[PDB]
Design a protein around this ligand. Structure first.
Ligand SMILES: *[C@@H]1O[C@H](CO)[C@@H](O)[C@H](O)[C@H]1NC(C)=O
Ligand SMILES: O=C(O)c1cnccn1
Length: 515
């Protein structure tokens, strides 16, 4: 194919404008995923109680702390209980000479009159809107899991649709569906409906992710291909900073979700000016249309020499791409061939570990430190040098030790985050950020390494199995957070163990750098 790109301009003005226009969309797409650090933040809460919250009642000489001690019992964290209140005011508990033995569990009841939430950091969140607290606490990670399951299902459906209807067309309607479903999620009347619209938004997020990369590849000359994939990966890095920036100003979840959805109407509009992939058009037997796309790009780049092109030139020079129909393959082939079974297991486990760990940790920054805006910013700022350093080390040291050391760095940081005492918020934040940076670097490594462990006809199938394994592990990510009932050490121990085990396994792969 490359001769046509070289005749049309393989890295010209068009490819520059296209890379910029697609990176910007990836930034906003990243905000959509990271949003529920803020859209679903848990403000501190207690039961509603007459002496505290009945604004029409007669006043008293008591201070707020006195009334609070009189009305809500203490919880383990030296703070008011989040799910109980006293059945009758405990006037006897006001004196400092009182004892915890002065009252019994029968003197307490759950929040019959509902909850009261701290509005000082966020004006509203879904947790406050639908009372996803106490007995209902599981519903937040369930919502996150449903979104990530949407990404898995959407990626499964994207393949057939992208091959049958075209790269740009599926990208276009994915942008529109993201806009519409995000806007609808911002105004959902009930929690089940919010879950449904987040699922249908994720279904489109998968399409944007897949077709952005594909449509960059099929218009980029091979000399520039690694760089363009790297820029695609930096899109998410800047997306984290953008999430912090937008969420710092917009403290209301409805307006926040709306603000991050509205851009995709603009993405939808300008996706009509992109050209459809010329490889796909010729492979599907439409060289007369592919000729128009090629001359369109040439017009943008300025290559008047495109006057040389004809459908005969295209059909003569792209037959080698058309010939790919000869050799089908399937996922089971990876496991049948005796030499490829072991590589497949270890590679898939590494993809899984990326997805599981990242979407386990990066969606509860409120547990990792005291300021989630700075945490959300720093997991971008540190992620940039992590990705770039991965590309350096993966060239100097080979694939195997870079992948292994990246995953081991991640796992040992996340595990150390169980031992550092909760008083030391700064050090805990630092270890969390570095642990996430290691996982990003591991993503870079395993993306490249999985493209080399396999023979050329099974390369695509192996990378596909890997990507679906990562998407599948992300589903289990949030659900492991429910183990926090036994103390926050346990979710962190699990999220820390998985990358250590997969990193150790990665040492058993064969090295693939040219030696
Ligand atoms: C609130 O206080 C007023 C005071 O007159 C009282 O009539 C009303 O029943 C109280 N309501 C609750 C829910 O405490
Ligand atoms: O996708 C990203 O930009 C990323 C990945 N791992 C850690 C932090 N950021």
């Amino acid at each position: 194919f490359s001769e046509l790109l070289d005749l049309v301009g393989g890295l010209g003005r068009f490819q520059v404008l296209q890379t910029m226009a697609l990176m910007v969309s990836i930034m906003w797409l990243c905000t959509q995923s990271m949003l529920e650090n803020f859209s679903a933040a848990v403000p501190s809460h207690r039961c509603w109680a007459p002496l505290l919250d009945n604004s029409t009642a007669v006043s008293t000489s008591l201070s707020p702390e006195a009334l609070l001690a009189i009305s809500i019992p203490p919880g383990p964290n030296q703070r008011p209980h989040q799910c109980r209140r006293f059945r009758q005011p405990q006037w006897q508990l006001l004196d400092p000479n009182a004892t915890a033995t002065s009252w019994s569990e029968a003197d307490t009841e759950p929040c019959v009159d509902g909850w009261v939430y701290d509005r000082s950091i966020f004006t509203s969140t879904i947790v406050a809107k639908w009372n996803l607290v106490c007995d209902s606490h599981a519903l937040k990670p369930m919502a996150q899991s449903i979104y990530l399951a949407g990404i898995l299902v959407g990626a499964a459906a994207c393949g057939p649709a992208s091959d049958r209807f075209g790269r740009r067309l599926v990208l276009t309607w994915s942008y529109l569906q993201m806009a519409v479903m995000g806007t609808a999620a911002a105004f959902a009347p009930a929690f089940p409906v919010y879950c449904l619209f987040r699922f249908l938004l994720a279904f489109a997020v998968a399409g944007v992710m897949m077709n952005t990369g594909t449509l960059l590849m099929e218009w980029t000359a091979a000399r520039a291909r690694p760089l363009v994939m790297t820029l695609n990966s930096l899109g998410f890095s800047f997306g984290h900073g953008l999430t912090a920036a937008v969420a710092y100003g917009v403290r209301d979840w409805t307006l926040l979700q709306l603000v991050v959805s509205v851009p995709f109407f603009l993405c939808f509009l300008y996706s009509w000016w992109l050209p459809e992939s010329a490889r796909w058009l010729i492979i599907k037997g439409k060289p007369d249309q592919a000729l128009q796309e090629l001359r369109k790009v040439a017009r943008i780049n300025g290559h008047k020499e495109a006057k040389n092109l004809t459908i005969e030139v295209l059909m003569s020079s792209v037959k080698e791409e058309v010939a790919s129909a000869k050799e089908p393959r399937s996922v089971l082939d990876l496991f049948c061939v005796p030499g490829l079974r072991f590589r497949t297991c270890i590679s898939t486990l590494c993809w899984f570990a990326f997805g599981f760990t990242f979407f386990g940790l990066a969606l509860d920054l409120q547990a990792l430190g005291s300021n989630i805006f700075l945490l959300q910013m720093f997991i971008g700022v540190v992620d940039i040098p992590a990705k770039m350093g991965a590309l350096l080390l993966l060239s100097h040291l080979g694939r195997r030790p870079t992948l292994a050391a990246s995953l081991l760095l991640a796992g040992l940081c996340i595990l150390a985050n169980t031992l550092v005492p909760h008083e030391m918020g700064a050090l805990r934040s630092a270890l969390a950020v570095l642990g996430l940076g290691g996982v990003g670097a591991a993503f870079t490594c395993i993306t490249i390494y999985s493209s080399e462990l396999f023979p050329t006809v099974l390369r695509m199938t192996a990378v596909g199995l890997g990507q679906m394994a990562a998407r599948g592990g992300a589903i289990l990510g949030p659900l492991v957070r429910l183990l926090g009932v036994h103390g926050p050490w346990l979710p962190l121990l699990v999220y820390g163990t998985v990358p250590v085990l997969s990193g150790l396994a990665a040492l058993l792969l064969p090295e693939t750098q040219s030696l």
